[PDB]
Design a protein around this nucleic acid. Structure first.
Ligand code: CL
Length: 345
RNA sequence: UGUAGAUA
Protein backbone atom coordinates (compact mmCIF):
# COMPACT_ATOMS: atom_id res chain seq x y z
CA UNK A 1 0.00 0.00 0.00
CA UNK A 2 3.06 2.28 -0.04
CA UNK A 3 2.53 2.66 -3.79
CA UNK A 4 -1.15 3.43 -3.24
CA UNK A 5 -0.28 6.04 -0.61
CA UNK A 6 2.45 7.62 -2.76
CA UNK A 7 0.23 7.71 -5.87
CA UNK A 8 -2.49 9.55 -3.85
CA UNK A 9 -0.54 12.58 -2.54
CA UNK A 10 2.92 12.59 -4.20
CA UNK A 11 3.78 16.00 -2.74
CA UNK A 12 2.99 14.59 0.74
CA UNK A 13 5.82 12.05 0.34
CA UNK A 14 8.47 14.42 -1.04
CA UNK A 15 11.05 12.82 1.30
CA UNK A 16 10.52 9.32 -0.06
CA UNK A 17 13.75 7.42 -0.59
CA UNK A 18 14.79 4.32 -2.51
CA UNK A 19 15.76 2.54 0.71
CA UNK A 20 12.10 3.03 1.75
CA UNK A 21 10.76 0.82 -1.06
CA UNK A 22 12.06 -2.56 0.07
CA UNK A 23 9.41 -5.14 -0.86
CA UNK A 24 7.34 -2.61 -2.78
CA UNK A 25 9.96 -2.59 -5.60
CA UNK A 26 8.10 -4.94 -7.95
CA UNK A 27 4.85 -3.01 -7.57
CA UNK A 28 6.65 0.34 -7.99
CA UNK A 29 8.61 -0.73 -11.07
CA UNK A 30 5.47 -1.94 -12.89
CA UNK A 31 3.58 1.27 -12.18
CA UNK A 32 3.70 4.34 -14.41
CA UNK A 33 4.09 6.72 -11.45
CA UNK A 34 6.26 4.41 -9.35
CA UNK A 35 8.68 3.62 -12.15
CA UNK A 36 9.19 7.30 -12.88
CA UNK A 37 9.88 7.63 -9.15
CA UNK A 38 12.59 4.93 -9.09
CA UNK A 39 14.16 6.28 -12.29
CA UNK A 40 14.29 9.89 -11.06
CA UNK A 41 15.76 8.76 -7.73
CA UNK A 42 18.37 6.57 -9.43
CA UNK A 43 19.44 9.45 -11.70
CA UNK A 44 19.45 12.23 -9.07
CA UNK A 45 20.77 10.28 -6.05
CA UNK A 46 24.41 10.70 -5.08
CA UNK A 47 24.11 7.92 -2.47
CA UNK A 48 25.70 4.69 -3.71
CA UNK A 49 24.01 2.73 -0.89
CA UNK A 50 20.51 4.09 -1.59
CA UNK A 51 20.89 2.90 -5.17
CA UNK A 52 22.19 -0.48 -4.03
CA UNK A 53 19.23 -0.84 -1.67
CA UNK A 54 16.76 -1.74 -4.45
CA UNK A 55 19.17 -3.80 -6.59
CA UNK A 56 18.53 -7.10 -4.80
CA UNK A 57 14.85 -6.60 -5.57
CA UNK A 58 15.59 -5.70 -9.20
CA UNK A 59 17.68 -8.90 -9.57
CA UNK A 60 15.04 -11.02 -7.80
CA UNK A 61 12.34 -9.77 -10.18
CA UNK A 62 14.46 -9.38 -13.32
CA UNK A 63 12.34 -11.78 -15.38
CA UNK A 64 9.08 -10.05 -14.50
CA UNK A 65 10.58 -6.58 -15.14
CA UNK A 66 12.66 -6.83 -18.34
CA UNK A 67 9.55 -7.08 -20.55
CA UNK A 68 7.30 -4.74 -18.62
CA UNK A 69 6.25 -1.48 -20.27
CA UNK A 70 7.42 0.43 -17.19
CA UNK A 71 9.84 -1.94 -15.43
CA UNK A 72 12.22 -2.22 -18.40
CA UNK A 73 13.39 1.33 -17.66
CA UNK A 74 14.23 0.36 -14.06
CA UNK A 75 16.37 -2.59 -15.19
CA UNK A 76 18.13 -0.42 -17.80
CA UNK A 77 19.24 1.99 -15.05
CA UNK A 78 21.58 -0.67 -13.70
CA UNK A 79 23.27 -1.13 -17.07
CA UNK A 80 24.49 2.49 -17.15
CA UNK A 81 28.01 3.72 -16.68
CA UNK A 82 27.69 4.57 -13.04
CA UNK A 83 26.78 0.99 -12.17
CA UNK A 84 29.70 -1.31 -13.21
CA UNK A 85 29.61 -2.96 -9.81
CA UNK A 86 26.20 -4.43 -10.77
CA UNK A 87 26.72 -5.48 -14.42
CA UNK A 88 27.89 -9.05 -13.91
CA UNK A 89 25.16 -9.72 -11.34
CA UNK A 90 22.49 -8.21 -13.59
CA UNK A 91 23.70 -10.13 -16.67
CA UNK A 92 23.56 -13.36 -14.70
CA UNK A 93 20.02 -12.60 -13.60
CA UNK A 94 18.86 -12.41 -17.22
CA UNK A 95 21.32 -14.54 -19.19
CA UNK A 96 19.31 -17.72 -19.34
CA UNK A 97 16.22 -16.20 -20.99
CA UNK A 98 18.15 -13.87 -23.37
CA UNK A 99 17.05 -16.09 -26.32
CA UNK A 100 13.45 -15.12 -25.58
CA UNK A 101 14.19 -11.57 -24.45
CA UNK A 102 15.66 -10.73 -27.88
CA UNK A 103 12.23 -11.10 -29.55
CA UNK A 104 10.28 -9.06 -27.02
CA UNK A 105 9.52 -5.39 -27.53
CA UNK A 106 10.45 -4.21 -24.00
CA UNK A 107 13.08 -6.81 -22.99
CA UNK A 108 15.04 -6.21 -26.19
CA UNK A 109 15.69 -2.61 -25.13
CA UNK A 110 17.32 -4.00 -21.98
CA UNK A 111 19.59 -6.20 -24.10
CA UNK A 112 20.50 -3.26 -26.34
CA UNK A 113 21.39 -1.08 -23.34
CA UNK A 114 23.53 -3.87 -21.86
CA UNK A 115 25.43 -4.37 -25.12
CA UNK A 116 25.73 -0.57 -25.40
CA UNK A 117 27.40 -0.27 -22.03
CA UNK A 118 28.96 -3.35 -20.52
CA UNK A 119 32.51 -4.64 -20.97
CA UNK A 120 33.51 -7.14 -23.63
CA UNK A 121 33.51 -10.28 -21.42
CA UNK A 122 29.85 -9.72 -20.55
CA UNK A 123 28.95 -8.83 -24.14
CA UNK A 124 30.34 -12.19 -25.24
CA UNK A 125 28.35 -13.91 -22.50
CA UNK A 126 25.19 -12.26 -23.90
CA UNK A 127 26.16 -13.11 -27.49
CA UNK A 128 26.51 -16.78 -26.47
CA UNK A 129 22.76 -16.94 -25.98
CA UNK A 130 22.03 -15.00 -29.19
CA UNK A 131 23.94 -17.78 -30.99
CA UNK A 132 20.99 -20.11 -30.41
CA UNK A 133 18.40 -17.96 -32.22
CA UNK A 134 20.53 -15.76 -34.45
CA UNK A 135 18.95 -16.39 -37.88
CA UNK A 136 15.37 -15.81 -36.68
CA UNK A 137 16.57 -12.98 -34.46
CA UNK A 138 18.16 -11.05 -37.36
CA UNK A 139 14.81 -10.99 -39.22
CA UNK A 140 12.78 -10.02 -36.20
CA UNK A 141 11.25 -6.59 -35.67
CA UNK A 142 12.70 -6.58 -32.15
CA UNK A 143 15.69 -8.88 -32.48
CA UNK A 144 17.32 -7.13 -35.44
CA UNK A 145 18.12 -4.17 -33.18
CA UNK A 146 19.88 -6.48 -30.70
CA UNK A 147 21.93 -7.91 -33.58
CA UNK A 148 22.64 -4.44 -34.97
CA UNK A 149 23.85 -3.39 -31.52
CA UNK A 150 26.12 -6.43 -31.23
CA UNK A 151 27.76 -5.54 -34.57
CA UNK A 152 28.23 -1.87 -33.65
CA UNK A 153 29.64 -2.44 -30.14
CA UNK A 154 31.53 -5.78 -30.03
CA UNK A 155 34.91 -6.28 -31.63
CA UNK A 156 34.63 -7.86 -35.12
CA UNK A 157 36.12 -11.24 -34.20
CA UNK A 158 33.41 -11.97 -31.60
CA UNK A 159 30.55 -11.54 -34.09
CA UNK A 160 32.05 -13.95 -36.67
CA UNK A 161 29.10 -16.21 -35.84
CA UNK A 162 26.75 -13.52 -37.22
CA UNK A 163 28.72 -13.41 -40.50
CA UNK A 164 28.62 -17.21 -40.72
CA UNK A 165 24.85 -16.97 -40.32
CA UNK A 166 24.62 -14.52 -43.24
CA UNK A 167 26.65 -17.23 -45.06
CA UNK A 168 24.98 -20.37 -43.68
CA UNK A 169 23.29 -21.27 -47.01
CA UNK A 170 23.49 -20.11 -50.61
CA UNK A 171 20.35 -18.00 -50.37
CA UNK A 172 20.69 -16.51 -46.86
CA UNK A 173 22.30 -13.23 -47.94
CA UNK A 174 19.51 -12.77 -50.47
CA UNK A 175 16.86 -13.68 -47.86
CA UNK A 176 18.23 -11.09 -45.44
CA UNK A 177 18.92 -8.35 -48.02
CA UNK A 178 15.28 -8.43 -49.15
CA UNK A 179 13.93 -8.59 -45.52
CA UNK A 180 12.85 -5.26 -43.96
CA UNK A 181 14.71 -6.14 -40.77
CA UNK A 182 17.42 -8.51 -41.96
CA UNK A 183 18.62 -5.85 -44.37
CA UNK A 184 19.67 -3.58 -41.48
CA UNK A 185 21.88 -6.40 -40.24
CA UNK A 186 23.60 -6.75 -43.62
CA UNK A 187 24.14 -2.99 -43.59
CA UNK A 188 25.83 -2.81 -40.16
CA UNK A 189 28.05 -5.74 -41.13
CA UNK A 190 29.18 -3.83 -44.23
CA UNK A 191 29.90 -0.84 -41.95
CA UNK A 192 31.73 -2.53 -39.05
CA UNK A 193 33.20 -5.91 -40.06
CA UNK A 194 36.75 -6.53 -41.22
CA UNK A 195 37.46 -6.97 -44.95
CA UNK A 196 38.16 -10.58 -44.07
CA UNK A 197 34.53 -10.81 -43.04
CA UNK A 198 32.81 -8.61 -45.61
CA UNK A 199 34.45 -10.18 -48.67
CA UNK A 200 32.28 -13.37 -48.72
CA UNK A 201 29.20 -11.29 -47.84
CA UNK A 202 29.79 -8.92 -50.75
CA UNK A 203 30.53 -11.96 -52.90
CA UNK A 204 27.15 -13.48 -52.08
CA UNK A 205 25.31 -10.19 -52.77
CA UNK A 206 27.04 -9.91 -56.16
CA UNK A 207 25.78 -13.36 -57.20
CA UNK A 208 22.16 -12.11 -57.21
CA UNK A 209 22.95 -8.42 -57.79
CA UNK A 210 20.20 -7.40 -60.21
CA UNK A 211 17.47 -8.82 -57.96
CA UNK A 212 18.83 -7.26 -54.77
CA UNK A 213 19.56 -3.94 -56.50
CA UNK A 214 15.90 -3.52 -57.49
CA UNK A 215 14.41 -4.70 -54.18
CA UNK A 216 12.80 -2.13 -51.90
CA UNK A 217 15.21 -3.24 -49.19
CA UNK A 218 18.11 -4.71 -51.17
CA UNK A 219 18.84 -1.45 -52.95
CA UNK A 220 20.05 -0.02 -49.62
CA UNK A 221 22.20 -3.13 -49.19
CA UNK A 222 23.78 -2.50 -52.58
CA UNK A 223 24.19 1.17 -51.72
CA UNK A 224 26.16 0.18 -48.64
CA UNK A 225 28.40 -2.05 -50.78
CA UNK A 226 29.16 0.91 -53.03
CA UNK A 227 29.99 3.05 -50.01
CA UNK A 228 31.92 0.53 -47.86
CA UNK A 229 33.16 -2.00 -50.40
CA UNK A 230 36.45 -2.16 -52.22
CA UNK A 231 37.57 -0.29 -55.30
CA UNK A 232 37.19 -3.56 -57.18
CA UNK A 233 33.61 -3.96 -55.90
CA UNK A 234 32.71 -0.44 -57.04
CA UNK A 235 34.11 -1.27 -60.50
CA UNK A 236 32.13 -4.51 -60.74
CA UNK A 237 28.92 -2.65 -59.84
CA UNK A 238 29.59 0.37 -62.09
CA UNK A 239 30.45 -2.02 -64.92
CA UNK A 240 27.18 -3.91 -64.41
CA UNK A 241 25.25 -0.65 -64.05
CA UNK A 242 26.86 0.88 -67.13
CA UNK A 243 26.08 -2.14 -69.30
CA UNK A 244 22.40 -2.09 -68.30
CA UNK A 245 22.03 1.61 -67.67
CA UNK A 246 18.54 1.83 -69.09
CA UNK A 247 17.06 -1.08 -67.13
CA UNK A 248 18.64 0.07 -63.88
CA UNK A 249 17.70 3.71 -64.31
CA UNK A 250 14.05 3.09 -65.19
CA UNK A 251 13.10 0.94 -62.19
CA UNK A 252 11.99 2.41 -58.88
CA UNK A 253 14.54 0.94 -56.51
CA UNK A 254 17.58 0.28 -58.70
CA UNK A 255 17.55 3.87 -59.89
CA UNK A 256 18.84 4.87 -56.46
CA UNK A 257 21.79 2.52 -57.04
CA UNK A 258 22.99 4.49 -60.07
CA UNK A 259 22.62 7.69 -58.09
CA UNK A 260 24.83 6.17 -55.41
CA UNK A 261 27.50 5.25 -57.95
CA UNK A 262 27.43 8.84 -59.20
CA UNK A 263 28.05 10.15 -55.68
CA UNK A 264 30.69 7.73 -54.35
CA UNK A 265 32.44 7.15 -57.67
CA UNK A 266 35.81 8.31 -58.97
CA UNK A 267 36.12 10.29 -62.18
CA UNK A 268 36.71 7.10 -64.17
CA UNK A 269 33.56 5.44 -62.78
CA UNK A 270 31.43 8.45 -63.73
CA UNK A 271 33.03 8.37 -67.19
CA UNK A 272 31.73 4.80 -67.73
CA UNK A 273 28.20 5.93 -66.87
CA UNK A 274 28.30 9.14 -68.94
CA UNK A 275 29.65 7.08 -71.85
CA UNK A 276 26.84 4.53 -71.74
CA UNK A 277 24.35 7.41 -71.41
CA UNK A 278 25.57 9.11 -74.60
CA UNK A 279 26.05 6.00 -76.77
CA UNK A 280 24.60 5.96 -80.28
CA UNK A 281 22.54 2.73 -80.03
CA UNK A 282 22.17 2.60 -83.87
CA UNK A 283 19.04 4.50 -84.98
CA UNK A 284 17.35 4.76 -81.56
CA UNK A 285 17.54 7.88 -79.35
CA UNK A 286 20.57 8.20 -77.03
CA UNK A 287 19.95 6.59 -73.64
CA UNK A 288 20.38 9.90 -71.81
CA UNK A 289 17.44 11.41 -73.70
CA UNK A 290 15.13 8.41 -73.22
CA UNK A 291 16.06 8.44 -69.52
CA UNK A 292 14.86 12.04 -69.26
CA UNK A 293 11.38 10.91 -70.41
CA UNK A 294 11.17 8.35 -67.59
CA UNK A 295 9.56 8.73 -64.17
CA UNK A 296 12.60 7.41 -62.26
CA UNK A 297 15.50 7.89 -64.72
CA UNK A 298 15.09 11.66 -65.01
CA UNK A 299 16.32 11.93 -61.44
CA UNK A 300 19.33 9.84 -62.55
CA UNK A 301 20.08 12.23 -65.43
CA UNK A 302 19.81 15.19 -63.09
CA UNK A 303 22.28 13.56 -60.70
CA UNK A 304 24.70 12.90 -63.57
CA UNK A 305 24.83 16.61 -64.38
CA UNK A 306 25.34 17.52 -60.73
CA UNK A 307 28.20 15.09 -60.12
CA UNK A 308 30.40 14.86 -63.22
CA UNK A 309 33.31 16.98 -64.43
CA UNK A 310 32.75 19.94 -66.75
CA UNK A 311 34.41 17.90 -69.47
CA UNK A 312 32.02 14.99 -68.80
CA UNK A 313 29.02 17.37 -68.65
CA UNK A 314 30.10 18.72 -72.04
CA UNK A 315 29.35 15.38 -73.69
CA UNK A 316 25.94 15.23 -72.02
CA UNK A 317 25.15 18.72 -73.27
CA UNK A 318 26.22 17.95 -76.83
CA UNK A 319 23.99 14.81 -76.74
CA UNK A 320 20.83 16.37 -75.28
CA UNK A 321 21.10 19.72 -77.14
CA UNK A 322 18.94 18.65 -80.12
CA UNK A 323 16.22 16.68 -78.36
CA UNK A 324 14.97 19.51 -76.13
CA UNK A 325 11.62 20.76 -77.47
CA UNK A 326 10.33 17.17 -77.70
CA UNK A 327 11.28 16.84 -74.03
CA UNK A 328 9.51 20.10 -73.11
CA UNK A 329 6.01 18.63 -73.57
CA UNK A 330 6.61 15.11 -72.17
CA UNK A 331 5.10 14.50 -68.69
CA UNK A 332 6.83 16.95 -66.32
CA UNK A 333 9.38 17.60 -69.08
CA UNK A 334 9.03 21.34 -68.52
CA UNK A 335 10.22 20.79 -64.94
CA UNK A 336 13.02 18.39 -65.89
CA UNK A 337 14.77 20.81 -68.23
CA UNK A 338 14.09 23.70 -65.87
CA UNK A 339 16.34 22.04 -63.32
CA UNK A 340 18.93 21.41 -66.04
CA UNK A 341 18.55 25.05 -67.18
CA UNK A 342 21.88 26.03 -65.59
CA UNK A 343 23.86 23.69 -67.85
CA UNK A 344 22.15 24.78 -71.09
CA UNK A 345 21.81 28.54 -70.26
C1' U B 1 7.52 13.67 -60.82
C1' G B 2 10.63 8.50 -57.20
C1' U B 3 12.43 4.23 -51.54
C1' A B 4 13.15 1.63 -45.49
C1' G B 5 13.49 -0.36 -38.18
C1' A B 6 10.84 -1.95 -31.67
C1' U B 7 9.29 1.54 -25.74
C1' A B 8 5.69 5.65 -21.11
CL1 CL C 1 25.53 -19.51 -54.40
Amino acid sequence: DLLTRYRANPAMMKNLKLSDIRGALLKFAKDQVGSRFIQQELASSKDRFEKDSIFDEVVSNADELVDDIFGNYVVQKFFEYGEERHWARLVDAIIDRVPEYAFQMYACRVLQKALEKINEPLQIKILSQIRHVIHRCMKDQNGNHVVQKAIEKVSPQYVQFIVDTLLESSNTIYEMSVDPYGCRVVQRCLEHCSPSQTKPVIGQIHKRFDEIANNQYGNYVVQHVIEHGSEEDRMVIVTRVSNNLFEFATHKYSSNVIEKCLEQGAVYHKSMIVGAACHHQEGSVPIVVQMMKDQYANYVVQKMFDQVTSEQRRELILTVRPHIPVLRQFPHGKHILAKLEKYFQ
